[PDB]
Design a protein around this nucleic acid. Sequence first.
RNA 1: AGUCGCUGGGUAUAGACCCGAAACCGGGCGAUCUAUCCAUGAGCAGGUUGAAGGUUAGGUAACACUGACUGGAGGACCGA
Length: 89
Amino acid sequence: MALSVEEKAQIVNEYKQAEGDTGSPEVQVALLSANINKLQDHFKANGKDHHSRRGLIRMVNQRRKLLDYLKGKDVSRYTALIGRLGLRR
RNA sequence: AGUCGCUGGGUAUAGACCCGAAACCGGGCGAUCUAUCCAUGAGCAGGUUGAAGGUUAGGUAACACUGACUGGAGGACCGA
Ligand SMILES: [Mg+2]
Ligand SMILES: [Mg+2]
Ligand SMILES: [Mg+2]
């Protein structure tokens, strides 16, 4: 929950599939990706924060699970999501 | 019966019959050899090996990590 409400409100509308959409995998993956990348700065300065890293790993596993489900449903939608977000490194 | 000479034998102090040390001390001369240093120059054919690093393709949540290409380290190797 390191993302502010403004940042959350910022990225939800760029990845929403329709008005009022906050549960679609694109919003979820984009929500996790922005939080994952933001936390990278914290873990650089705080390298002994093993307890907060457990939460970061969970966000990484959650994003992987969502992308794998999006793989089965619509591969074209999956492809656009990672290209826009720059995943699959 | 001493005393002063002269000559000779002996003695004392002197190198004291001649030659001969290892050494000791004083003043000088030497670092064109050599030992270390200082400054300023010069030399080291040829052939190997293949560190760190880099790039790239992967890979990682990120750091990592892997391959290839590269790179050219070393009181390193063979050898004038
Ligand atoms: Mg000389
Ligand atoms: Mg040598
Ligand atoms: Mg030799």
